[PDB]
Design a protein around this motif. Structure first.
Motif, PDB file in Angstrom:
ATOM      1  N   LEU A   1       4.496  87.836  45.486  1.00 17.38           N
ATOM      2  CA  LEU A   1       4.098  86.724  45.223  1.00 17.38           C
ATOM      3  C   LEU A   1       4.938  86.218  43.920  1.00 17.38           C
ATOM      4  O   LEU A   1       5.170  86.932  42.991  1.00 17.38           O
ATOM      5  CB  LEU A   1       2.438  86.837  44.602  1.00 17.38           C
ATOM      6  CG  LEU A   1       1.502  87.326  45.483  1.00 17.38           C
ATOM      7  CD1 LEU A   1      -0.035  87.237  44.740  1.00 17.38           C
ATOM      8  CD2 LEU A   1       1.670  86.285  46.692  1.00 17.38           C
ATOM      9  N   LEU A   2       5.316  84.768  44.126  1.00 18.60           N
ATOM     10  CA  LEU A   2       5.689  84.130  42.965  1.00 18.60           C
ATOM     11  C   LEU A   2       4.764  82.962  42.730  1.00 18.60           C
ATOM     12  O   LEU A   2       4.290  82.268  43.728  1.00 18.60           O
ATOM     13  CB  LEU A   2       6.969  83.324  43.467  1.00 18.60           C
ATOM     14  CG  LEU A   2       7.978  82.741  42.345  1.00 18.60           C
ATOM     15  CD1 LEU A   2       8.450  83.480  41.336  1.00 18.60           C
ATOM     16  CD2 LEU A   2       9.072  82.077  43.193  1.00 18.60           C
ATOM     17  N   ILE A   3       4.533  82.614  41.603  1.00 17.22           N
ATOM     18  CA  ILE A   3       3.304  81.882  41.027  1.00 17.22           C
ATOM     19  C   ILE A   3       3.961  81.023  39.922  1.00 17.22           C
ATOM     20  O   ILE A   3       4.290  81.385  38.906  1.00 17.22           O
ATOM     21  CB  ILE A   3       2.234  82.890  40.269  1.00 17.22           C
ATOM     22  CG1 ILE A   3       1.768  84.013  41.279  1.00 17.22           C
ATOM     23  CG2 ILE A   3       1.125  82.146  39.960  1.00 17.22           C
ATOM     24  CD1 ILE A   3       1.122  85.242  40.782  1.00 17.22           C
ATOM     25  N   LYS A   4       3.494  79.647  40.131  1.00 17.93           N
ATOM     26  CA  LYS A   4       3.644  78.500  39.192  1.00 17.93           C
ATOM     27  C   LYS A   4       2.509  78.823  37.908  1.00 17.93           C
ATOM     28  O   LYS A   4       1.435  79.368  38.260  1.00 17.93           O
ATOM     29  CB  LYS A   4       3.574  77.242  39.907  1.00 17.93           C
ATOM     30  N   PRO A   5       2.806  78.194  36.714  1.00 19.74           N
ATOM     31  CA  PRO A   5       1.543  78.302  35.533  1.00 19.74           C
ATOM     32  C   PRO A   5       0.499  77.956  35.909  1.00 19.74           C
ATOM     33  O   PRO A   5      -0.483  78.416  35.673  1.00 19.74           O
ATOM     34  CB  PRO A   5       2.444  77.723  34.517  1.00 19.74           C
ATOM     35  CG  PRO A   5       3.917  77.338  35.059  1.00 19.74           C
ATOM     36  CD  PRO A   5       3.984  77.465  36.315  1.00 19.74           C
ATOM     37  N   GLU A   6       0.357  76.899  36.856  1.00 22.95           N
ATOM     38  CA  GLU A   6      -1.068  76.398  36.917  1.00 22.95           C
ATOM     39  C   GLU A   6      -1.889  77.560  37.644  1.00 22.95           C
ATOM     40  O   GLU A   6      -3.100  77.285  37.647  1.00 22.95           O
ATOM     41  CB  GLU A   6      -0.944  75.093  37.836  1.00 22.95           C
ATOM     42  CG  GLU A   6      -0.075  73.891  37.373  1.00 22.95           C
ATOM     43  CD  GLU A   6       1.309  74.003  37.021  1.00 22.95           C
ATOM     44  OE1 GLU A   6       1.991  74.816  37.809  1.00 22.95           O
ATOM     45  OE2 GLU A   6       1.953  73.447  36.270  1.00 22.95           O
ATOM     46  N   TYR A   7      -1.378  78.394  38.405  1.00 19.59           N
ATOM     47  CA  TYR A   7      -2.110  79.349  39.050  1.00 19.59           C
ATOM     48  C   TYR A   7      -2.106  80.686  38.271  1.00 19.59           C
ATOM     49  O   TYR A   7      -2.748  81.757  38.699  1.00 19.59           O
ATOM     50  CB  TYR A   7      -1.841  79.420  40.482  1.00 19.59           C
ATOM     51  CG  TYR A   7      -2.104  78.412  41.325  1.00 19.59           C
ATOM     52  CD1 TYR A   7      -1.056  77.283  41.460  1.00 19.59           C
ATOM     53  CD2 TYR A   7      -3.125  78.151  42.186  1.00 19.59           C
ATOM     54  CE1 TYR A   7      -1.471  76.061  42.186  1.00 19.59           C
ATOM     55  CE2 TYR A   7      -3.512  77.198  42.944  1.00 19.59           C
ATOM     56  CZ  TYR A   7      -2.538  76.038  42.941  1.00 19.59           C
ATOM     57  OH  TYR A   7      -3.113  75.067  43.797  1.00 19.59           O
ATOM     58  N   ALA A   8      -1.583  80.813  37.133  1.00 17.31           N
ATOM     59  CA  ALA A   8      -1.572  82.009  36.200  1.00 17.31           C
ATOM     60  C   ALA A   8      -2.018  81.510  34.748  1.00 17.31           C
ATOM     61  O   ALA A   8      -3.272  81.677  34.843  1.00 17.31           O
ATOM     62  CB  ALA A   8       0.179  82.295  36.071  1.00 17.31           C
ATOM     63  N   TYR A   9      -1.274  81.314  33.698  1.00 15.04           N
ATOM     64  CA  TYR A   9      -1.713  81.199  32.494  1.00 15.04           C
ATOM     65  C   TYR A   9      -1.385  79.668  31.743  1.00 15.04           C
ATOM     66  O   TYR A   9      -1.806  79.362  30.789  1.00 15.04           O
ATOM     67  CB  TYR A   9      -1.057  82.037  31.658  1.00 15.04           C
ATOM     68  CG  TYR A   9      -1.399  83.554  31.881  1.00 15.04           C
ATOM     69  CD1 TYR A   9      -2.637  84.095  31.631  1.00 15.04           C
ATOM     70  CD2 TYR A   9      -0.547  84.545  32.664  1.00 15.04           C
ATOM     71  CE1 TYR A   9      -3.037  85.331  31.999  1.00 15.04           C
ATOM     72  CE2 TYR A   9      -1.015  85.594  32.971  1.00 15.04           C
ATOM     73  CZ  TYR A   9      -2.454  85.961  32.849  1.00 15.04           C
ATOM     74  OH  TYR A   9      -2.630  87.323  33.051  1.00 15.04           O
ATOM     75  N   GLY A  10      -0.809  78.696  32.572  1.00 12.52           N
ATOM     76  CA  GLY A  10      -0.719  77.384  32.503  1.00 12.52           C
ATOM     77  C   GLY A  10       0.028  77.000  31.279  1.00 12.52           C
ATOM     78  O   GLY A  10       0.784  77.719  30.403  1.00 12.52           O
ATOM     79  N   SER A  11      -0.328  75.718  30.544  1.00  7.49           N
ATOM     80  CA  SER A  11       0.375  75.356  29.483  1.00  7.49           C
ATOM     81  C   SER A  11       0.037  76.036  28.231  1.00  7.49           C
ATOM     82  O   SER A  11       0.733  76.027  27.297  1.00  7.49           O
ATOM     83  CB  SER A  11       0.163  73.682  29.236  1.00  7.49           C
ATOM     84  OG  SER A  11      -1.135  73.375  29.232  1.00  7.49           O
ATOM     85  N   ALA A  12      -1.069  76.700  28.203  1.00  9.77           N
ATOM     86  CA  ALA A  12      -1.549  77.433  26.874  1.00  9.77           C
ATOM     87  C   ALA A  12      -0.885  78.659  26.890  1.00  9.77           C
ATOM     88  O   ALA A  12      -0.536  79.248  26.020  1.00  9.77           O
ATOM     89  CB  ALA A  12      -3.049  77.526  26.951  1.00  9.77           C
ATOM     90  N   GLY A  13      -0.358  79.334  28.099  1.00  8.88           N
ATOM     91  CA  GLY A  13       0.100  80.703  28.053  1.00  8.88           C
ATOM     92  C   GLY A  13      -0.973  81.560  27.557  1.00  8.88           C
ATOM     93  O   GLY A  13      -2.271  81.270  27.708  1.00  8.88           O
ATOM     94  N   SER A  14      -0.489  82.776  27.269  1.00  4.79           N
ATOM     95  CA  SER A  14      -1.417  83.935  26.690  1.00  4.79           C
ATOM     96  C   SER A  14      -0.676  84.581  25.735  1.00  4.79           C
ATOM     97  O   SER A  14      -0.134  85.908  25.974  1.00  4.79           O
ATOM     98  CB  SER A  14      -1.777  84.831  27.712  1.00  4.79           C
ATOM     99  OG  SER A  14      -2.909  85.726  27.408  1.00  4.79           O
ATOM    100  N   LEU A  15      -0.338  84.106  24.594  1.00  7.42           N
ATOM    101  CA  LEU A  15       0.582  84.543  23.604  1.00  7.42           C
ATOM    102  C   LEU A  15      -0.132  85.532  22.794  1.00  7.42           C
ATOM    103  O   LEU A  15      -1.372  85.615  22.679  1.00  7.42           O
ATOM    104  CB  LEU A  15       0.942  83.370  22.778  1.00  7.42           C
ATOM    105  CG  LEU A  15       2.011  82.539  23.360  1.00  7.42           C
ATOM    106  CD1 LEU A  15       2.432  81.278  22.507  1.00  7.42           C
ATOM    107  CD2 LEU A  15       3.457  83.305  23.428  1.00  7.42           C
ATOM    108  N   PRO A  16       0.532  86.596  22.336  1.00  4.53           N
ATOM    109  CA  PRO A  16       2.101  86.801  22.488  1.00  4.53           C
ATOM    110  C   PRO A  16       2.705  87.346  23.608  1.00  4.53           C
ATOM    111  O   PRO A  16       3.827  87.032  23.819  1.00  4.53           O
ATOM    112  CB  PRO A  16       2.469  87.458  21.335  1.00  4.53           C
ATOM    113  CG  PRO A  16       1.294  88.301  21.028  1.00  4.53           C
ATOM    114  CD  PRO A  16       0.073  87.672  21.395  1.00  4.53           C
ATOM    115  N   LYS A  17       1.942  87.681  24.818  1.00  7.68           N
ATOM    116  CA  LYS A  17       2.640  88.337  25.824  1.00  7.68           C
ATOM    117  C   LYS A  17       2.962  87.384  26.884  1.00  7.68           C
ATOM    118  O   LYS A  17       4.092  87.595  27.474  1.00  7.68           O
ATOM    119  CB  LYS A  17       1.664  89.600  26.273  1.00  7.68           C
ATOM    120  CG  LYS A  17       1.084  89.545  27.592  1.00  7.68           C
ATOM    121  CD  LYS A  17       1.057  90.982  28.295  1.00  7.68           C
ATOM    122  CE  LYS A  17       0.676  91.959  27.080  1.00  7.68           C
ATOM    123  NZ  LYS A  17       1.066  93.314  27.350  1.00  7.68           N
TER     124      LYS A  17
END
Ligand SMILES: COc1cc2cc(c1OC)O[C@H](C)CCn1cc(nn1)CCCOC(=O)[C@@H]1CCCCN1C(=O)[C@H]2C1CCCCC1
Length: 128
Positions: free
Chosen positions: A93-109
């Motif tokens: 699977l390849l995944i755009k941010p909208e279906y993962a962690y989005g603009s916020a992300g999940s910092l620091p990882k």
């Protein structure tokens, strides 16, 4: 690499058809049954940022990753993607941010707006 092959040849498995989750079947599974929402699902996986800067593997626990499908225990791309898989199947699977962690992300990882890649093996799934 595997991610580029998915970009170019991967099937768009989103309902919206926005290419947010692209899938290649790498090893065909057994039976026609794919898991239902609520089902207990057992997988091995390797995952990375598409940049390759962070790499994560269930194999490094030597033990499967277990979760209940469609209960938001995982990013939306997994609830969507693992739902399409058969017992024994291996998929990319390849995944755009909208279906993962989005603009916020999940910092620091995980940074903002990150594209993710996974290899997933569906080992088993069992009714709730
Ligand atoms: C954002 O945080 C993490 C992301 C990822 C792995 C993380 C992680 O730290 C919590 O290390 C954990 C020690 C692994 C076990 N695990 C699985 C989940 N929670 N813990 C399930 C929820 C979060 O993970 C996800 O939904 C996805 C799908 C299931 C497997 C792990 N997932 C990830 O996003 C990895 C991520 C992949 C890309 C490279 C960095 C790690």
């Amino acid at each position: 690499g595997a991610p580029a092959t998915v970009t170019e040849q991967g099937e768009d498995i989103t309902s919206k058809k926005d290419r947010g989750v692209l899938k290649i079947v790498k090893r065909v599974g057994n039976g026609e049954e794919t898991p239902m929402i609520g089902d207990k699902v057992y997988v091995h996986y390797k995952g990375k940022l598409s940049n390759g800067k962070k790499f994560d593997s269930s194999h490094d626990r030597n033990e499967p990753f277990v979760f209940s499908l469609g209960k938001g225990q995982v990013i939306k791309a997994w609830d969507i993607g693992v739902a399409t898989m058969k017992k024994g199947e291996i998929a990319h699977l390849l995944i755009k941010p909208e279906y993962a962690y989005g603009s916020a992300g999940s910092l620091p990882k995980i940074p903002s707006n990150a594209t993710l890649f996974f290899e997933i093996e569906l080992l088993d799934f069992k009714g709730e």
